[model samples]
Target: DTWTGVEALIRILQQLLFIHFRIGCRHSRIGIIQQRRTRNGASKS
Candidate 1:
């Protein structure tokens, strides 16, 4: 059934998007923390 196949594809896409969003958020948070650390280090030096 083509409809069934389409549904499966959509489900997979949704999961991929969800995972991508989670990873993006984590990376952004890490980048912000690193930036703050670097700024503090620069000020100290």
Candidate 2:
């Protein structure tokens, strides 16, 4: 449940970022890159 909320929060952040930039959904590219880093970091531990 907690994880789902975090996931949802990320989705909302992506949308707001896109809106703020007036650039459609492209803003989530930053979030995707950040998530990639977190995933790689977690795998090592």
Best of the candidates, lDDT: 1
lDDT of 2 by residue, 1-45 (tens): 579989999999999877887764454455655445456545234
Per-residue lDDT over 1-45 for candidate 1, one digit per residue giving the tens place of the 0 to 100 score: 579998999999999999998987886557555445456544235
What do the candidate models score in CA lDDT, each in turn?
0.74, 0.66
Q: Give every collision pair in model 2.
A: none
TM-score per candidate, chains pooled: 0.58, 0.41
Off by over 4 Å in 1: 30-45
lDDT of 2 at 20: 80
